Coordinates of N, CA and C in Angstrom, one line a residue:
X1 N 0.8 -1.2 0.0 CA 0.0 0.0 0.0 C 0.8 1.3 0.0
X2 N 2.0 1.2 0.7 CA 3.0 2.3 0.8 C 3.1 3.1 -0.4
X3 N 3.3 2.5 -1.5 CA 3.6 3.1 -2.8 C 2.4 4.0 -3.3
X4 N 1.2 3.8 -2.8 CA 0.1 4.6 -3.2 C 0.1 6.0 -2.5
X5 N 0.8 6.0 -1.4 CA 0.8 7.1 -0.5 C 2.1 7.9 -0.5
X6 N 2.9 7.6 -1.5 CA 4.1 8.2 -1.6 C 4.1 9.7 -1.9
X7 N 3.0 10.2 -2.6 CA 2.9 11.6 -2.9 C 1.6 12.2 -2.4
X8 N 1.1 13.2 -3.2 CA -0.1 13.9 -2.8 C -1.3 13.2 -3.4
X9 N -2.2 12.8 -2.5 CA -3.4 12.1 -3.0 C -4.7 12.9 -2.8
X10 N -5.5 13.0 -3.8 CA -6.8 13.6 -3.7 C -7.7 12.8 -2.8
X11 N -8.4 13.5 -2.0 CA -9.3 12.8 -1.1 C -10.7 13.3 -1.4
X12 N -11.7 12.4 -1.2 CA -13.1 12.7 -1.3 C -13.9 12.1 -0.2
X13 N -14.7 12.8 0.5 CA -15.5 12.3 1.6 C -17.0 12.6 1.3
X14 N -17.8 11.7 1.7 CA -19.3 11.7 1.5 C -19.9 11.0 2.7
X15 N -20.7 11.7 3.5 CA -21.4 11.2 4.6 C -22.9 11.5 4.5
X16 N -23.7 10.6 4.8 CA -25.2 10.7 4.9 C -25.5 10.6 6.4
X17 N -26.3 11.5 6.9 CA -26.5 11.5 8.3 C -27.9 11.7 8.8
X18 N -28.2 11.1 9.9 CA -29.5 11.2 10.6 C -29.2 11.2 12.1
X19 N -29.4 12.4 12.7 CA -29.1 12.5 14.1 C -30.4 12.9 14.8
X20 N -30.9 12.0 15.6 CA -32.2 12.1 16.2 C -33.2 12.5 15.2
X21 N -33.2 11.8 14.1 CA -34.2 12.1 13.0 C -33.9 13.3 12.3
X22 N -32.8 14.0 12.7 CA -32.4 15.1 11.9 C -31.5 14.7 10.8
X23 N -31.9 14.9 9.5 CA -31.1 14.4 8.4 C -30.3 15.4 7.7
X24 N -29.1 15.0 7.2 CA -28.1 15.9 6.5 C -27.1 15.2 5.7
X25 N -26.5 15.9 4.9 CA -25.4 15.3 4.0 C -24.2 16.3 4.0
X26 N -23.0 15.7 3.8 CA -21.8 16.5 3.8 C -21.0 15.9 2.7
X27 N -20.3 16.8 1.9 CA -19.3 16.5 1.0 C -18.0 17.1 1.4
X28 N -16.9 16.4 1.2 CA -15.6 16.9 1.5 C -14.6 16.7 0.4
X29 N -13.6 17.6 0.2 CA -12.6 17.5 -0.8 C -11.3 18.0 -0.2
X30 N -10.2 17.4 -0.6 CA -9.0 17.8 -0.1 C -7.9 16.9 -0.7
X31 N -6.8 16.9 0.0 CA -5.7 16.0 -0.3 C -4.9 15.6 0.9
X32 N -4.3 14.5 0.8 CA -3.5 14.0 1.9 C -2.1 13.8 1.5
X33 N -1.2 13.9 2.4 CA 0.2 13.7 2.0 C 0.9 13.0 3.2
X34 N 0.6 11.6 3.2 CA 1.0 10.7 4.2 C 2.5 10.8 4.6
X35 N 3.3 11.2 3.7 CA 4.7 11.4 4.0 C 4.9 12.4 5.1
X36 N 4.0 13.3 5.2 CA 4.1 14.3 6.2 C 3.0 14.2 7.3
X37 N 2.2 13.2 7.1 CA 1.1 13.0 8.1 C 0.0 14.1 8.0
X38 N 0.0 14.7 6.8 CA -0.8 15.9 6.6 C -2.1 15.7 5.8
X39 N -3.2 16.3 6.3 CA -4.5 16.2 5.7 C -5.0 17.7 5.6
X40 N -5.5 18.0 4.4 CA -6.1 19.3 4.2 C -7.4 19.1 3.6
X41 N -8.6 19.4 4.2 CA -9.8 19.3 3.6 C -10.8 20.4 3.8
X42 N -11.7 20.5 2.9 CA -12.9 21.4 3.1 C -14.2 20.6 3.0
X43 N -15.1 20.9 4.0 CA -16.4 20.2 4.1 C -17.6 21.1 3.9
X44 N -18.5 20.6 3.2 CA -19.7 21.4 3.0 C -21.0 20.6 3.4
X45 N -21.8 21.3 4.2 CA -23.1 20.7 4.5 C -24.0 20.9 3.3
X46 N -24.3 19.9 2.5 CA -25.0 20.2 1.3 C -26.5 20.3 1.4
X47 N -27.0 19.8 2.5 CA -28.4 19.9 2.7 C -28.9 21.1 3.5
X48 N -28.0 22.1 3.6 CA -28.4 23.3 4.4 C -27.5 23.6 5.6
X49 N -28.1 23.6 6.8 CA -27.4 23.9 8.0 C -27.1 22.7 8.7
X50 N -25.8 22.5 9.2 CA -25.4 21.3 10.0 C -26.2 21.3 11.3
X51 N -26.9 20.2 11.5 CA -27.7 20.0 12.7 C -27.0 19.7 13.9
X52 N -25.7 19.3 13.8 CA -24.8 19.1 14.9 C -23.6 20.0 14.7
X53 N -22.7 20.0 15.7 CA -21.6 20.8 15.6 C -20.5 20.2 14.8
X54 N -19.8 21.0 13.9 CA -18.8 20.4 13.0 C -17.7 19.6 13.7
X55 N -17.2 20.2 14.8 CA -16.1 19.5 15.5 C -16.5 18.1 15.9
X56 N -17.8 17.8 16.0 CA -18.2 16.5 16.4 C -18.0 15.5 15.3
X57 N -17.9 15.9 14.1 CA -17.7 15.0 12.9 C -16.3 14.8 12.5
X58 N -15.4 15.6 13.0 CA -14.0 15.4 12.5 C -13.5 14.0 12.4
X59 N -13.7 13.3 13.6 CA -13.1 11.9 13.7 C -13.7 11.0 12.6
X60 N -15.0 11.3 12.4 CA -15.7 10.5 11.4 C -15.2 10.8 10.0
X61 N -15.0 12.1 9.6 CA -14.6 12.5 8.3 C -13.1 12.0 8.1
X62 N -9.6 8.8 7.8 CA -8.7 8.3 6.7 C -7.2 8.2 7.3
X63 N -7.1 7.3 8.3 CA -5.9 7.1 8.9 C -4.8 6.6 8.0
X64 N -5.2 6.2 6.8 CA -4.1 5.8 5.9 C -3.2 7.0 5.6
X65 N -3.6 8.2 6.0 CA -2.8 9.4 5.8 C -1.9 9.7 6.9
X66 N -1.9 8.9 7.9 CA -1.1 9.1 9.1 C 0.4 8.8 8.6
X67 N 1.3 9.5 9.3 CA 2.7 9.2 9.0 C 3.3 8.1 9.9
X68 N 3.7 7.0 9.2 CA 4.2 5.9 10.0 C 5.8 5.9 9.9
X69 N 6.4 6.2 11.0 CA 7.9 6.4 10.8 C 8.4 5.1 10.2
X70 N 9.6 5.2 9.5 CA 10.2 4.1 8.8 C 10.2 2.8 9.7
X71 N 10.6 3.0 10.9 CA 10.7 1.8 11.8 C 9.3 1.2 12.1
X72 N 8.3 1.9 11.9 CA 7.0 1.4 12.2 C 6.1 1.0 11.0
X73 N 6.6 1.2 9.8 CA 5.8 0.8 8.7 C 5.1 -0.5 8.9
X74 N 5.8 -1.5 9.4 CA 5.2 -2.8 9.5 C 3.9 -2.8 10.3
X75 N 3.7 -1.7 11.0 CA 2.5 -1.6 11.8 C 1.4 -0.9 11.1
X76 N 1.7 -0.3 9.9 CA 0.6 0.5 9.2 C -0.5 -0.3 8.7
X77 N -1.6 -0.5 9.5 CA -2.6 -1.3 8.9 C -3.3 -0.6 7.8
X78 N -3.5 0.7 8.0 CA -4.3 1.4 7.1 C -3.9 1.4 5.6
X79 N -2.7 1.6 5.4 CA -2.1 1.7 4.0 C -2.1 0.3 3.4
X80 N -1.8 -0.7 4.3 CA -1.7 -2.1 3.9 C -3.0 -2.6 3.2
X81 N -4.1 -2.2 3.8 CA -5.4 -2.6 3.2 C -5.6 -2.0 1.8
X82 N -4.8 -1.1 1.4 CA -5.1 -0.5 0.1 C -4.5 -1.2 -1.1
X83 N -5.1 -1.1 -2.3 CA -6.2 -0.2 -2.6 C -7.6 -0.7 -2.3
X84 N -7.8 -2.0 -2.2 CA -9.1 -2.5 -2.0 C -9.9 -1.8 -0.9
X85 N -9.1 -1.5 0.2 CA -9.7 -0.7 1.2 C -10.1 -1.5 2.5
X86 N -10.7 -0.7 3.4 CA -11.0 -1.2 4.7 C -12.3 -0.6 5.1
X87 N -13.0 -1.3 6.0 CA -14.2 -0.9 6.6 C -13.9 -0.3 8.0
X88 N -14.6 0.7 8.3 CA -14.4 1.4 9.6 C -15.7 1.6 10.3
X89 N -15.8 1.0 11.5 CA -17.0 1.2 12.2 C -16.7 1.7 13.6
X90 N -17.6 2.7 14.0 CA -17.6 3.3 15.4 C -19.0 3.5 16.0
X91 N -18.8 3.6 17.3 CA -19.8 4.0 18.3 C -19.1 5.1 19.1
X92 N -19.6 6.3 19.1 CA -19.0 7.4 19.8 C -20.0 7.9 20.8
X93 N -19.6 7.7 22.1 CA -20.5 8.0 23.2 C -20.3 9.4 23.7
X94 N -21.3 10.2 23.6 CA -21.2 11.6 24.1 C -21.7 11.5 25.6
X95 N -20.8 11.8 26.5 CA -21.2 11.7 27.9 C -22.3 12.6 28.2
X96 N -23.3 11.9 28.9 CA -24.5 12.6 29.3 C -25.3 13.0 28.1
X97 N -25.0 12.4 27.0 CA -25.7 12.7 25.8 C -25.9 11.6 24.9
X98 N -26.2 11.8 23.6 CA -26.5 10.7 22.7 C -25.3 10.0 22.2
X99 N -25.5 9.0 21.3 CA -24.4 8.3 20.6 C -24.5 8.4 19.1
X100 N -23.3 8.3 18.5 CA -23.2 8.2 17.0 C -22.8 6.8 16.7
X101 N -23.4 6.2 15.6 CA -23.0 4.9 15.1 C -22.7 5.2 13.6
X102 N -21.5 4.8 13.3 CA -21.0 5.1 11.9 C -20.5 3.8 11.3
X103 N -20.7 3.7 10.0 CA -20.2 2.7 9.1 C -19.7 3.4 7.9
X104 N -18.4 3.2 7.6 CA -17.7 3.8 6.5 C -16.9 2.8 5.7
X105 N -16.6 3.2 4.5 CA -15.7 2.3 3.7 C -14.7 3.2 3.1
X106 N -13.4 2.9 3.3 CA -12.3 3.7 2.9 C -11.5 2.9 1.8
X107 N -11.5 3.4 0.6 CA -10.8 2.8 -0.5 C -10.5 3.7 -1.7
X108 N -9.7 3.3 -2.7 CA -9.4 4.1 -3.9 C -10.5 3.9 -4.9
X109 N -10.7 5.0 -5.5 CA -11.6 5.1 -6.7 C -10.6 5.7 -7.7
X110 N -9.9 4.9 -8.4 CA -8.9 5.3 -9.3 C -7.8 6.0 -8.5
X111 N -7.6 7.2 -8.8 CA -6.5 8.0 -8.1 C -7.0 8.6 -6.8
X112 N -8.3 8.6 -6.6 CA -8.9 9.2 -5.5 C -9.1 8.3 -4.3
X113 N -8.8 8.8 -3.1 CA -9.0 8.1 -1.9 C -10.3 8.5 -1.3
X114 N -11.3 7.6 -1.3 CA -12.6 8.0 -0.9 C -13.0 7.4 0.5
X115 N -13.8 8.2 1.2 CA -14.3 7.8 2.5 C -15.8 8.0 2.4
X116 N -16.6 6.9 2.3 CA -18.0 6.9 2.3 C -18.6 6.4 3.6
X117 N -19.4 7.2 4.2 CA -19.9 7.0 5.6 C -21.4 7.1 5.8
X118 N -22.0 6.2 6.6 CA -23.4 6.3 7.0 C -23.3 6.6 8.5
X119 N -24.0 7.7 9.0 CA -23.9 8.0 10.4 C -25.3 8.1 11.0
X120 N -25.5 7.5 12.1 CA -26.7 7.4 12.8 C -26.5 7.8 14.2
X121 N -27.3 8.9 14.7 CA -27.2 9.4 16.0 C -28.6 9.3 16.7
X122 N -28.6 8.8 17.9 CA -29.8 8.6 18.7 C -29.5 9.0 20.2
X123 N -30.6 9.3 21.0 CA -30.5 9.6 22.4 C -29.9 10.9 22.7
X124 N -29.8 11.8 21.7 CA -29.3 13.1 21.9 C -30.3 14.0 22.6
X125 N -29.9 14.8 23.5 CA -30.7 15.8 24.2 C -31.0 17.0 23.2
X126 N -32.3 17.4 23.1 CA -32.6 18.4 22.1 C -32.0 19.7 22.6
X127 N -31.7 19.8 23.9 CA -31.2 20.9 24.6 C -29.7 20.5 25.0
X128 N -29.1 19.6 24.3 CA -27.8 19.2 24.6 C -26.8 20.1 24.1
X129 N -25.5 19.8 24.5 CA -24.4 20.6 23.9 C -24.3 20.4 22.4
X130 N -24.7 19.2 21.9 CA -24.7 18.9 20.5 C -25.8 19.5 19.7
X131 N -27.0 19.0 20.0 CA -28.3 19.4 19.4 C -28.4 20.9 19.6
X132 N -28.1 21.4 20.8 CA -28.0 22.8 21.1 C -26.8 23.6 20.7
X133 N -25.9 23.1 19.9 CA -24.7 23.7 19.4 C -23.9 24.5 20.5
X134 N -23.6 23.8 21.6 CA -22.9 24.5 22.7 C -21.4 24.2 22.6
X135 N -20.9 23.7 21.5 CA -19.5 23.5 21.4 C -18.7 24.5 20.6
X136 N -17.5 24.9 21.2 CA -16.6 25.8 20.5 C -16.2 25.2 19.2
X137 N -16.0 26.0 18.2 CA -15.5 25.7 16.9 C -14.0 25.6 17.0
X138 N -13.5 24.5 17.6 CA -12.0 24.3 17.7 C -11.8 22.8 18.0
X139 N -10.6 22.4 18.2 CA -10.2 21.0 18.3 C -9.0 20.8 19.1
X140 N -9.0 19.8 20.0 CA -7.8 19.6 20.8 C -6.9 18.5 20.2
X141 N -5.6 18.5 20.7 CA -4.7 17.5 20.2 C -4.9 16.3 21.1
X142 N -4.4 15.1 20.7 CA -4.5 13.9 21.6 C -4.1 12.7 20.9
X143 N -4.2 11.6 21.6 CA -3.8 10.3 21.2 C -4.9 9.3 20.8
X144 N -4.6 8.5 19.8 CA -5.5 7.4 19.3 C -4.8 6.1 19.5
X145 N -5.3 5.2 20.3 CA -4.8 4.0 20.7 C -5.1 2.8 19.7
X146 N -4.0 2.3 19.2 CA -4.2 1.2 18.3 C -3.7 -0.1 18.8
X147 N -4.5 -1.1 18.5 CA -4.2 -2.5 18.9 C -4.8 -3.5 17.9
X148 N -4.0 -4.6 17.7 CA -4.4 -5.6 16.8 C -5.6 -6.3 17.2
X149 N -6.3 -6.7 16.2 CA -7.5 -7.5 16.5 C -7.5 -8.7 15.6
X150 N -7.0 -9.8 16.1 CA -6.9 -11.0 15.3 C -8.2 -11.7 14.8
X151 N -9.0 -12.2 15.7 CA -10.3 -12.8 15.3 C -11.2 -11.8 14.5
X152 N -10.6 -11.3 13.4 CA -11.2 -10.4 12.6 C -10.2 -9.9 11.6
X153 N -9.0 -10.3 11.8 CA -8.0 -9.9 10.8 C -8.1 -8.4 10.6
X154 N -8.1 -7.6 11.8 CA -8.3 -6.2 11.8 C -7.7 -5.6 13.1
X155 N -8.0 -4.4 13.3 CA -7.5 -3.8 14.5 C -8.6 -3.2 15.3
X156 N -8.4 -2.9 16.5 CA -9.3 -2.3 17.4 C -8.8 -1.0 17.7
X157 N -9.6 0.1 17.8 CA -9.1 1.4 18.1 C -9.9 2.0 19.1
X158 N -9.2 2.7 20.1 CA -9.9 3.4 21.2 C -9.3 4.7 21.5
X159 N -10.1 5.7 21.9 CA -9.7 7.0 22.2 C -10.8 7.9 22.7
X160 N -10.4 8.9 23.4 CA -11.3 9.9 23.9 C -11.1 11.3 23.3
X161 N -12.1 11.9 22.8 CA -12.0 13.2 22.3 C -12.8 14.1 23.2
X162 N -12.1 15.2 23.5 CA -12.6 16.2 24.4 C -13.1 17.5 23.7
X163 N -14.4 17.7 23.5 CA -14.8 18.9 22.9 C -15.0 20.0 23.9
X164 N -14.5 21.1 23.7 CA -14.6 22.3 24.6 C -16.0 22.8 24.5
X165 N -16.7 23.0 25.6 CA -18.0 23.6 25.6 C -17.8 25.1 25.8
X166 N -18.7 25.9 25.3 CA -18.5 27.4 25.3 C -18.5 28.0 26.7
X167 N -19.0 27.2 27.7 CA -19.0 27.7 29.1 C -17.7 27.4 29.8
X168 N -16.7 26.9 29.0 CA -15.4 26.5 29.6 C -15.3 25.0 29.9
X169 N -16.4 24.3 30.0 CA -16.4 22.9 30.3 C -16.0 22.0 29.0
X170 N -16.1 20.7 29.2 CA -15.7 19.7 28.2 C -16.8 18.7 27.9
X171 N -17.0 18.4 26.6 CA -17.9 17.4 26.2 C -17.1 16.2 25.7
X172 N -17.0 15.2 26.6 CA -16.3 14.0 26.3 C -17.0 13.2 25.2
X173 N -16.2 12.8 24.3 CA -16.7 11.9 23.2 C -15.8 10.7 23.2
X174 N -16.3 9.6 23.7 CA -15.6 8.4 23.8 C -15.7 7.5 22.5
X175 N -14.6 7.2 21.9 CA -14.6 6.5 20.6 C -14.2 5.0 20.8
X176 N -15.0 4.1 20.2 CA -14.7 2.7 20.0 C -14.9 2.4 18.6
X177 N -13.8 2.0 18.0 CA -13.7 1.8 16.6 C -13.1 0.5 16.2
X178 N -13.6 -0.1 15.1 CA -13.2 -1.3 14.5 C -12.9 -1.2 13.0
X179 N -11.8 -1.7 12.5 CA -11.5 -1.8 11.1 C -11.1 -3.2 10.6
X180 N -11.5 -3.5 9.4 CA -11.2 -4.7 8.8 C -11.1 -4.6 7.3
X181 N -10.2 -5.2 6.7 CA -9.9 -5.0 5.3 C -11.2 -5.3 4.5
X182 N -11.4 -4.7 3.4 CA -12.5 -4.9 2.5 C -12.4 -6.2 1.8
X183 N -11.2 -6.5 1.3 CA -11.0 -7.8 0.6 C -10.8 -9.0 1.4
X184 N -10.3 -10.1 0.7 CA -9.9 -11.3 1.3 C -8.4 -11.3 1.4
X185 N -8.0 -10.1 1.0 CA -6.6 -9.7 0.8 C -5.9 -9.6 2.2
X186 N -4.6 -9.6 2.1 CA -3.7 -9.5 3.3 C -3.6 -8.1 3.8
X187 N -3.3 -8.0 5.0 CA -3.1 -6.7 5.7 C -2.0 -6.8 6.7
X188 N -1.5 -5.8 7.2 CA -0.5 -5.9 8.2 C -1.2 -5.8 9.6
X189 N -0.8 -6.6 10.5 CA -1.4 -6.5 11.9 C -0.3 -5.8 12.7
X190 N -0.7 -4.8 13.5 CA 0.2 -4.0 14.2 C 0.3 -4.5 15.6
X191 N 1.4 -4.0 16.3 CA 1.6 -4.1 17.7 C 0.9 -2.9 18.3
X192 N 0.7 -2.9 19.5 CA 0.1 -1.7 20.1 C 0.9 -0.5 19.9
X193 N 0.2 0.6 19.5 CA 0.8 1.9 19.4 C -0.2 2.9 19.4
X194 N 0.2 4.1 19.1 CA -0.9 5.1 19.0 C -0.5 6.2 18.0
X195 N -1.5 6.9 17.6 CA -1.3 8.0 16.6 C -1.4 9.3 17.4
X196 N -0.4 10.1 17.2 CA -0.4 11.4 17.9 C -1.0 12.4 16.9
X197 N -2.1 13.0 17.3 CA -2.9 13.9 16.4 C -3.1 15.3 16.8
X198 N -3.3 16.2 15.8 CA -3.6 17.6 16.0 C -4.4 18.2 14.8
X199 N -5.3 19.1 15.1 CA -6.2 19.6 14.1 C -6.6 21.0 14.3
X200 N -6.8 21.7 13.3 CA -7.2 23.1 13.4 C -8.4 23.3 12.4
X201 N -9.5 23.9 12.9 CA -10.6 24.2 12.1 C -10.6 25.6 11.7
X202 N -11.0 25.9 10.5 CA -11.0 27.3 10.1 C -12.3 27.6 9.2
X203 N -12.3 28.8 8.7 CA -13.4 29.1 7.8 C -13.0 29.8 6.6
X204 N -13.7 29.7 5.5 CA -13.5 30.3 4.2 C -14.5 31.5 4.1
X205 N -13.9 32.7 4.2 CA -14.6 33.9 4.2 C -15.5 34.1 3.0
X206 N -15.2 33.3 2.0 CA -16.0 33.3 0.8 C -17.1 32.3 0.7
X207 N -16.9 31.2 1.3 CA -18.0 30.2 1.4 C -19.2 30.7 2.1
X208 N -20.3 30.6 1.5 CA -21.6 31.0 2.2 C -22.3 29.8 2.7
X209 N -21.9 28.6 2.3 CA -22.6 27.5 2.8 C -22.0 27.1 4.1
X210 N -22.8 26.2 4.8 CA -22.3 25.7 6.1 C -21.1 24.8 5.8
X211 N -20.0 25.1 6.4 CA -18.8 24.3 6.1 C -17.8 24.2 7.2
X212 N -16.7 23.5 6.9 CA -15.6 23.4 7.8 C -14.3 23.2 7.0
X213 N -13.3 24.0 7.2 CA -11.9 23.8 6.7 C -11.1 23.1 7.7
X214 N -10.4 22.1 7.3 CA -9.6 21.3 8.3 C -8.2 21.1 7.9
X215 N -7.3 21.3 8.8 CA -5.9 21.1 8.6 C -5.4 20.2 9.7
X216 N -4.8 19.0 9.4 CA -4.5 18.0 10.4 C -3.2 17.3 10.1
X217 N -2.5 16.9 11.2 CA -1.3 16.2 11.2 C -1.4 15.1 12.2
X218 N -0.9 13.9 11.8 CA -1.0 12.7 12.7 C 0.2 11.8 12.4
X219 N 0.9 11.4 13.4 CA 2.1 10.6 13.3 C 2.1 9.5 14.3
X220 N 2.3 8.3 13.8 CA 2.3 7.1 14.7 C 3.5 7.1 15.6
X221 N 3.3 6.7 16.9 CA 4.4 6.7 17.8 C 4.2 5.5 18.7
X222 N 5.0 5.4 19.8 CA 5.0 4.4 20.8 C 5.7 3.1 20.5
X223 N 6.6 3.2 19.4 CA 7.4 2.0 19.1 C 8.8 2.5 18.8

């Protein structure tokens, strides 16, 4: 897979969503440059106004673009599954609030690296930090824990995302994620490690639509 990520890859993201019966769609475009662990994307709510807060979707909107130091390449599960791809599934628990259930498929469409996702959210408080848009438009750095998952020929991934609430508090979002190759094809199984991540959300003064500009860097460590 390594050889597909050697340069600048166009990325395309498409999510269909239903949160507490609130329905929406988002398209994203950008490019990734795994060599530097860099992702640059722009997202647009195509169905109007985003019913949830943008920062809540970041995790959901391609770890194959993480930078795996030379010594760790053997642990890169993401790239290994390419081009056929991998399936990525999560449940993201918002403390004292609802949950998101996501199913995505990450693979190449020719030259393009695509992420197609179905997202379902239930149990959200209509007056919650989420439904009530109480989260700051920003994003914290942190770690993503990776571990091999044999009886599935995949990996298990766990982490906590802390969204800042505008009152100064925090909205914890606990992530439980599973990935498995799309094919019958081989993949690399990693030893435990983690991805060190950081992100910055911005806006395009020109875009009138509901959107998010995202700049992100992630580098595998712990080995």
